[PDB]
Paper text:
The pro-oncogenic cellular activities of estrogen receptor alpha (ERα) drive breast cancer pathogenesis. Ligand-dependent transcriptional activities depend on the association of coactivator proteins with ERα to form functional complexes. SERMs and SERDs elicit a structural rearrangement of the ERα LBD to sterically preclude binding of coactivators in the activating function-2 cleft. Activating somatic mutations near ERα helix 12, Y537S and D538G, enable hormone therapy resistance in metastatic ER +breast cancers.
We solved x-ray crystal structures of antiestrogens in complex with Y537S and WT ERα ligand binding domain (LBD) to understand the structural basis of differential transcriptional antagonistic efficacies. LA-5 possesses a 2 S methylpyrrolidine and showed a SERM-like profile with an IC50 of 15.68+0.27 nM and a normalized fluorescence of 1.706 ± 0.09 at 5 μM. LA3-2 and LA5-2 are subsequently referred to as LA-Deg and LA-Stab for Laso degrader and stabilizer respectively. We discovered that addition of a 3R-methyl group on Laso’s pyrrolidine induced both ERα SUMOylation and degrading activities, while addition of a 2S-methyl on the pyrrolidine leads to an accumulation of ERα in the breast cancer cells. LA-Deg induces SUMOylation but to a lesser maximum than fulvestrant and GDC0927 in WT and is further reduced in Y537S, while LA-Stab did not induce SUMOylation with either receptor. Laso, LA-Stab, and LA-Deg showed intermediate efficacy. In these Y537S structures, H12 is slightly more dynamic and the S537-E380 hydrogen bond is no longer observed. Overall, these structures present canonical ERα LBD homodimers with 2–4 monomers in the asymmetric unit.
Author numbering:
A (entry chain B): 307 to 336, 341 to 416, 421 to 529, 535 to 550
B (entry chain A): 306 to 338, 341 to 417, 420 to 461, 464 to 528, 535 to 545
The structure:
């Protein structure tokens, strides 16, 4: 796991990818928040499956897996959405049957921020292999500064998370080296990619403000993560 | 000529631009309590020096005043926060708001303690990484340039965004150069670059939480007056 090569890391992440789900409406019939909520809830189940396949994640305690997904889940939905939307300028591909433009989004604020991210991804010509690295970084990084714990186990947990994050950095650099970029270009693109994650955090916080405005997730996460081996 | 700077010239430029460390203004001969009031007054005085600082970050005054305002509107609380975390770095468990205002997390209990704890953790993480002064000024400049650059489509705006990203690239070059100079291997350089940049997502998170607090009880006009 920390023993994986760059190519094995990339292969593992690509293999872990969740499916693209559909909105649940009658397409024969003639609302929006309900559709998005239902989609997101279904997507969360698959997200837990994906998370367990990110190298290193199931090495963590269940408490820490819950903490990381509780921190990162909306970021992860958002980056998935932005990736799906990357070749549909001005629109957001929530699902193959739910492609919305900004007028249909009317918070249109969240909507515009997501569109700009998709644009930035298009500008950078983000690759699939880069995307899955970034999404795994979100999963490992977003909650790693907010463990409210300094037990010896917590120190070990945090060290492991940072070692896995380091392996993903190595993997990104390797992908860029393989694509012919100079060392200078390599560190510049690495930086460009990681700085977008700040914007994605911003978007998640804005979205969370919207959802909390609608009146514990940790219990659901724990239920889905704390699986038995009876299958 | 900002894009023509060497890494060493970029670093000297940034170190030279650093704002002063301000004091809280209260009567120290008087009994202690007024916390938000003290922190607000401090933050407001610190904002004026921030504008001065930003105009000295290579490349920033090449931008339109509209875009300078937009970048500082996005980033100002992040910038106050990374400043605080930096001067708190050698004070485990406390936050050095000012040399005469050093607070532990219990004193922050007077929705604040949540923000206090996140800031303390960032100071811890800086301690663990042994963040250097030259790295810190690079990171703070990156916040200034990056935080608002996804939320500005005119020809001018395309040109502005390209310039911002080119300056950000030069600061990335500069970080890597600092790390190479400190004797780190190429692998260690890229790993440390990534570790430093990923802390910026947490600082963004902290800013949004803090903004929720401040709005709970327009700035661009004040920024414009100060920048113009
Ligand atoms: C999944 C969450 C966790 C438990 C309860 N459930 C509440 C609903 O959460 C959401 C999350 C995202 C959305 C929208 C969405 C849907 C699917 C997806 O792949 C991407 C996104 C991105 C954000 C979007 C949204 C978020 C907040 C406010 C409006 C829209 C809507 C509701
Ligand atoms: C400066 C701004 C812009 C216009 C009005 N003015 C109000 C913002 O006020 C604050 C008040 C407190 C802070 C606290 C602080 C003070 C000084 C400084 O160097 C660092 C910080 C870190 C954040 C901190 C804060 C922010 C929100 C809630 C509680 C504490 C930051 C900004």
């Amino acid at each position: 796991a920390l023993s994986l090569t760059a190519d094995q890391m990339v292969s593992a992440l690509l293999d872990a990818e969740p499916p693209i789900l559909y909105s649940e409406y009658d397409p024969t019939r003639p609302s929006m928040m309900g559709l998005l909520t239902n989609l997101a809830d279904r997507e969360l189940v698959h997200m837990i499956n994906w998370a367990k396949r990110v190298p290193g994640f199931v090495d963590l305690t269940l408490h820490d897996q819950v903490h990381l997904l509780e921190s990162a889940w909306l970021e992860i939905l958002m980056i998935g959405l932005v990736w799906r939307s990357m070749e549909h300028p001005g629109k957001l591909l929530f699902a193959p049957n739910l492609l919305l433009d900004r007028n249909q989004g009317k918070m249109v604020e969240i909507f515009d921020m997501l569109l700009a991210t998709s644009s930035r991804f298009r500008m950078m010509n983000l690759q699939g292999e880069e995307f899955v690295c970034l999404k795994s970084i979100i999963l490992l990084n977003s909650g790693v500064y907010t463990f409210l714990s300094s037990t010896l186990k917590s120190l070990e947990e945090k060290d492991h998370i940072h070692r896995v994050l380091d392996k993903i950095t190595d993997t990104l650099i390797h992908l860029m080296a393989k694509a012919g970029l100079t060392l200078q270009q390599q560190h510049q693109r690495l930086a460009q990619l990681l700085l977008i994650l700040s914007h994605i955090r911003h978007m998640s916080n804005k979205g969370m403000e919207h959802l909390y405005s609608m009146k514990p997730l940790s219990d659901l996460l724990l239920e889905m993560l704390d699986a038995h081996r009876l299958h």
